[model samples]
Target: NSYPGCPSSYDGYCLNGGVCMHIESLDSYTCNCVIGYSGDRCQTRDLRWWELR
Candidate 1:
């Protein structure tokens, strides 16, 4: 089997700017939200990713 690659193989907006981390044990994924980003989908507009820096 071949992974399409991170972000590419990612599910979706949950892939929203968030990095992808695969969980082999569960055969699932974890989206690592970027700065100021949150939620499982990282769809929240926290603005903190740039509001303070």
Candidate 2:
């Protein structure tokens, strides 16, 4: 099966331990960001804790 390599396959594809999920049906991918992270690539921080602190 040779469609395309997931962006997550490469180092630093998804930041902060985010997992890259590939949607074969859509031929695209999305970043399943972990806690305290958000955005297309989990690059953005929740910042709520920081703001609270």
Candidate 3:
């Protein structure tokens, strides 16, 4: 279940490490990164001060 470039230890799931976020859905799972972070993991490659914009 591993996505390319994602951590092998992730087991296709990410919870911590500022890499991935798990959103609880009624029937299935969703994966994504928090604001300011993007990628298979929640790793933030850039820091922007105007994220509010």
Candidate 4:
């Protein structure tokens, strides 16, 4: 939950890889993984056997 630009949840902007979504009662957000990667903050490795070499 790192918002480099503005304060945390100040306006409606979130850090990269973060998806902002407003709920009925609460404001919610989630981190989205890039292509070929899957996990929070897209930190997970998406490697193959060839890449290991």
Strongest candidate by lDDT: 2
Q: Please list the Cα RMSD from the true structure of every candidate, rounded to 1 decimal place.
A: 6.5, 7.6, 8.5, 9.7
lDDT values for all models: 0.55, 0.61, 0.46, 0.41
Cα lDDT of model 4 by residue, 1-53, tens digit: 33323236454343345444333333343344445443443455463332222
* Per-residue alpha-carbon lDDT of candidate 1 for residues 9-50, written as tens digits (9 for 90 to 100): 534736557755555555655555767676544766475553
Q: What TM-score, computed on C-alpha atoms, does each candidate reach?
A: 0.39, 0.48, 0.27, 0.29
Q: For model 2, what is the alpha-carbon lDDT of residue 8?
A: 33
lDDT of 4 at 28: 40
Prediction 1 global C-alpha lDDT: 0.55
| Cα lDDT over the full model 3 | 0.46
lDDT of 2 by residue, 1-53 (tens): 11434763456667877766656666766665755776666777774332231
The number of residue pairs in model 1 that clash at the backbone is 2
Off by over 4 Å in 4: 1-29, 47-53
Q: How well is each residue in 1-53 modelled by candidate 3, as lDDT tens digits? A: 43324445447454444443443344333455556654544544445452454
Between candidates 2 and 4, name the one with more favorable lDDT.
2
lDDT over C-alpha atoms for residue 34 of model 4: 48
Against the true structure, whose TM-score is highest?
2
